[PDB]
């Protein structure tokens, strides 16, 4: 009947929760129906604009785990949604497009779709506002967490890559640069670059903040419906998985501890040296990358990978997890057998890139996979801005496993080695890795010395 | 929006990606096309060609299975002089250097050195430019188009060059071909119309500048097999070329090289009846060029499943009329191909 417009309102909310307002309304002229043919062959289709003169702003909670130590696995999502809701309020106040929340990290761009000339002002002013907001949360809930902020300006190419859990995002050498400069930013004060000071116009309390170890600075102040219900159901199963799609029907928010659960970060090692930006922004390198990520999103659609969830893809990194469909024990099944199938995913996706290396002539991709398992907390972030994501200790431990990983080999965590060892796989002891946040850690790579030795 | 007509004039463009290994003639052929359809550094890189050529000659004189000896060793100092300028990034190109290069180019031990140009890497426009630049020992001459087409400058990255042909747009992509460049190709595999795959047929008895241990033509065949099945190019026709015809002809009629010594399946190879050679064309050379055509067409036989067709031609990129004829035929074929969508 008329309810079709209701379902179209839902689908419009879904779009507006994965892509900026601008391109959300742009995709609401439905002239080119090639995405409509994505809903329903050589190169997968994707759209990526190479936009110059945009700012990037990252911000990580400082001392996050020290706060998330003993929350109720639900109050954590509560306070975190409060924080990012203040942050979104500030985004609209400051006219700057947020992009996503990488676990603890939160980041935005200053007008990539709709350019601006004051974008540096907009960006770092939002940074200062974020400092204010986290300071007020610090003395409102009484939590000892401030957040380090980093800003870098330049050119970024913004678009969508992937088929499963695709989200408007940004990529460059400048994005990664803002990332590291936040990583080198001392808490509470925005850590900016030469590239944004070169037109900051000194209207702020310029403070040349060296690293304690490219001329970075520091600042601190101064009928026909069935198609439509199909499309909306697909976009929703995109943005959030099935079980949460059920639980959210009846509940305002969502949150769930998972005492056992595995997570893998598959990062392509030698992308940034395959990506030569001399061409038209080199967005064709990102086209090849999207063609790759397509093969992992394809892997997801196998039968036996039902329980696997691609949480998101962070640039070249690919972040997957399991142990989320597991809601009841079965008599003839083993509990932690899911860690096998997820692990097999890892192996398979390794194999996948070798297929992509057959179609990649006189160059090879090399992805390192980091594997961990343990406790974690899954949650859903916003209202009218839906964003499924998981935190905990497995997330960061596996990310720092991968980031300390070796390519073409699966770096596994210790207790994961213990559990997997009985399941037939033969690991080889790597030694000891100094994991930021855990000190020395014992690690086991998967292939039994696949190289010579 | 002013973008509708822009997209529709895009859809009316023939994308001609130039592929194929290095020193094959992609840059030469695109220079040819722009000559047929369309500021002083050129003379300088021609002189760089001369210098690099003569240096490669004089250097390899010591590192063959016999060390090549000058028939007039009284010019030995000259050789030493040439070995002294071996790597001088800046150069004035003095007249005494040119006289040195010529006086060496006259010796016949130097000649026997050059004739063995297959056992070491060497540029293909050496013997030409030596003779042709002996004339331009002066300063106030600009070289003709023939000299500009035999100019050997290295290709490093996608060079997008446009041109029009009687109210048909054309946008081709000259590309490098050395091993270090072959990662750059897969950028421009997007909606490309035809893949002019250049090959150096006279490079069957030489080795590549990658490792001096792979037969240039065996390497070209491996690369053709690699891009023939390239899962992004299982729908795009490969308008094969077989460039460097005249060099091939001179090599075969020279009688010094043995293709059967380099490739065993030539002794038991027969001339095919579909031969369409021009009058006064040696049956041995014709059998050879068609043998190479068959070695390239076998790659396009065992696979493909009739989604993409290889349309081999023959060409000499430094023969403007040859490119004119073969590109008219190419224009027919890509008219039939681009519209296939
Ligand atoms: N005799 C003859 N020589 C040719 C012909 N085509 C190319 N050459 C010669 O071969 C050499 C290599 O040509 P070149 O222009 O460098 O190809 P390329 O595509 O640029 O090679 P690269 O840049 O990928 S390494 C040049 O010296 C050129 O003179 C031809 O048809 N006949
Ligand atoms: Mg070239």
Tab-separated table of C-alpha atoms in Angstrom, chain A residues 263-269 293 296 312-320 345-346 349-350 366-371 398-399 402-403:
chain	number	residue	atom	x	y	z
A	263	UNK	CA	39.498	-11.690	15.518
A	264	UNK	CA	41.920	-11.408	12.602
A	265	UNK	CA	43.573	-8.404	11.017
A	266	UNK	CA	44.816	-9.104	7.494
A	267	UNK	CA	46.968	-6.171	6.437
A	268	UNK	CA	48.472	-6.016	2.968
A	269	UNK	CA	52.146	-5.331	3.584
A	293	UNK	CA	38.890	-6.674	-1.257
A	296	UNK	CA	37.471	-11.361	0.543
A	312	UNK	CA	35.195	-3.461	8.549
A	313	UNK	CA	38.159	-2.726	6.301
A	314	UNK	CA	40.470	0.082	7.425
A	315	UNK	CA	42.222	1.186	4.269
A	316	UNK	CA	44.297	-1.787	3.165
A	317	UNK	CA	43.666	-3.610	6.453
A	318	UNK	CA	40.840	-6.152	6.592
A	319	UNK	CA	39.261	-6.787	9.988
A	320	UNK	CA	37.207	-9.946	10.520
A	345	UNK	CA	39.243	-18.226	6.640
A	346	UNK	CA	42.681	-16.792	7.319
A	349	UNK	CA	42.226	-15.588	2.279
A	350	UNK	CA	45.978	-16.035	2.186
A	366	UNK	CA	51.795	-9.929	0.504
A	367	UNK	CA	49.348	-9.819	3.390
A	368	UNK	CA	50.247	-10.555	6.987
A	369	UNK	CA	47.472	-11.898	9.167
A	370	UNK	CA	47.325	-11.506	12.920
A	371	UNK	CA	45.051	-13.784	14.910
A	398	UNK	CA	45.262	-8.839	17.450
A	399	UNK	CA	45.825	-5.484	15.766
A	402	UNK	CA	49.315	-8.034	12.911
A	403	UNK	CA	51.126	-4.687	12.972
